[PDB]
Amino acid sequence: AAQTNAPWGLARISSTSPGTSTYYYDESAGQGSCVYVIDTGIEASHPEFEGRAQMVKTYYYSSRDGNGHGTHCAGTVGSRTYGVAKKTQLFGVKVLDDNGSGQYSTIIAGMDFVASDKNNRNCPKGVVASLSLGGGYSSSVNSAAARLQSSGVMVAVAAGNNNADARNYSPASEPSVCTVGASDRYDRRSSFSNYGSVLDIFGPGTDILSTWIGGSTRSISGTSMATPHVAGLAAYLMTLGKTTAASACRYIADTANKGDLSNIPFGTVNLLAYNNYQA
Ligand SMILES: [Ca+2]
Numbered sequence: 001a002a003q004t005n006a007p008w009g010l011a012r013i014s015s016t017s018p019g020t021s022t023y024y025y026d027e028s029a030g031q032g033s034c035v036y037v038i039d040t041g042i043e044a045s046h047p048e049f050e051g052r053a054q055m056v057k058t059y060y061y062s063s064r065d066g067n068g069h070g071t072h073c074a075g076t077v078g079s080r081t082y083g084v085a086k087k088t089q090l091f092g093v094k095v096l097d098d099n100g101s102g103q104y105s106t107i108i109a110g111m112d113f114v115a116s117d118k119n120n121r122n123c124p125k126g127v128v129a130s131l132s133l134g135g136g137y138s139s140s141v142n143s144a145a146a147r148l149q150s151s152g153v154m155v156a157v158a159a160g161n162n163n164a165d166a167r168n169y170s171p172a173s174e175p176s177v178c179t180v181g182a183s184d185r186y187d188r189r190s191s192f193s194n195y196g197s198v199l200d201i202f203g204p205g206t207d208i209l210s211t212w213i214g215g216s217t218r219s220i221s222g223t224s225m226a227t228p229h230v231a232g233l234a235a236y237l238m239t240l241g242k243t244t245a246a247s248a249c250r251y252i253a254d255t256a257n258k259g260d261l262s263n264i265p266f267g268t269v270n271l272l273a274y275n276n277y278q279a
Contacts, residue, residue, distance in 0.1 A: 003081075014275050032239050034091060035127075039070030042090065042092035049075075053090040057094065084232025084235075115148050127153045128153065129154065132158045134158055142173060166195065180226050181202040195265050196267070206225075207220075233273055236275065
């Protein structure tokens with residue numbers, strides 16, 4: 001299948017070269033898999049989700065996304081026009097408030113919740129969790145991420161937006177999950193993207209068009225936008241039976257475009273997510 005005039009990021013992950021505008025993908029499109037978006041919530045009634053999104057847990061007075069961040073990330077995972085895996089099932093978990101802030105105890109609770117809740121859902125092709133959040137180092141936050149990964153969920157987390165070594169941030173610095181850096185449309189490291197040996201992979205993160213609250217759309221930037229590209233890609237490959245939850249991150253690194261990024265510091269991988277599609 002092919003989406004012409006796609007957002008540049010979707011085109012980029014189905015091509016060996018920058019500058020293309022068509023997104024090539026297999027029709028199965030992540031059907032049968034599930035992705036938990038752990039964020040500010042999801043505006044499930046957005047037409048772009050076609051009824052495939054729902055809220056399953058909130059830690060505040062309401063389950064509604066009063067911010068937009070969560071709705072944006074979810075859209076990149078699996079909305080019709082802006083998403084990698086256009087037929088996946090999306091589940092929203094609201095651990096961040098409408099200012100985009102959250103306590104680390106609440107974030108940990110949300111991760112433990114997904115590990116248990118997945119046993120109540122029908123997800124024959126596998127389960128992914130996408131975490132576009134983070135903060136200063138905490139061994140408790142890392143440990144919760146590692147538990148979630150160990151329970152059989154593919155865990156993707158943002159590297160962080162401090163233009164620094166991601167080893168001082170959590171859950172970015174947990175080695176057993178998949179830590180995602182950001183690139184721009186000219187194959188440069190995004191100027192804000194964290195880096196370092198703990199990074200596994202890069203995704204499109206600068207000027208990413210996606211869904212927003214009020215049934216709208218907007219373009220924003222961050223390692224937060226790169227993380228769902230990778231979460232979406234994992235769900236897509238699991239549906240195709242190419243890989244499993246335990247080994248999806250490594251499979252994505254092995255099959256990535258290599259050496260094509262610029263401004264990567266020594267000791268940071270030069271790998272860009274890539275779906276290897278062939279018609
Ligand atoms: Ca890792």
